[PDB]
Amino acid sequence: EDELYRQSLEIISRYLREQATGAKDTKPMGRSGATSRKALETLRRVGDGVQRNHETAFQGMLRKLDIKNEDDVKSLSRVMIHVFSDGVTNWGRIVTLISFGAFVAKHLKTINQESCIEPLAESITDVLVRTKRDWLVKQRGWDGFVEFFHVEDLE
């Protein structure tokens, strides 16, 4: 059940995994996820761009967090919740949380803790669904996600 937690976990886990290894993997998403494949494309397009823009800052911010094993995943959960603590929810903050999560995923592979990456995506999906499910539905879920970050091109 919870079709929304599924796919969400799938999209985020796919992104975190592929950003870690280097390349892409099993393309046929499962939902069936035309939307899921769109979202992954949007997430890797926008997410990478954001990662390039604040790569300098993320490094220090992640270094500050000091993540080194699975017990430190909890410390990432606390950060994500603090991002929405001002009451404001939008796609900009949500997509940036996933970009930073991707930056952490690479780090976990660097310190040879690749097994933490899936619990990491799990915690990111947890916070978004546990605390922002109504907003996600009201903004039409991952279809509202893609629609927001769709650029007209054209021409």
């Binding site: 911010m61 994500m80 796609w91 900009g92 903050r93």
Partner: peptide, 25 residues
């Protein structure tokens, strides 16, 4: 353990809202 949480969170907020403004229009 967790001694940070804040600072990092607020930084992510502003970056997120900047991205929000970037794709808003």
């Amino acid at each position: 353990p967790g001694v940070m949480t804040q600072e990092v969170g607020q930084l992510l907020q502003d970056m997120g809202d900047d991205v929000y403004q970037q794709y808003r229009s």
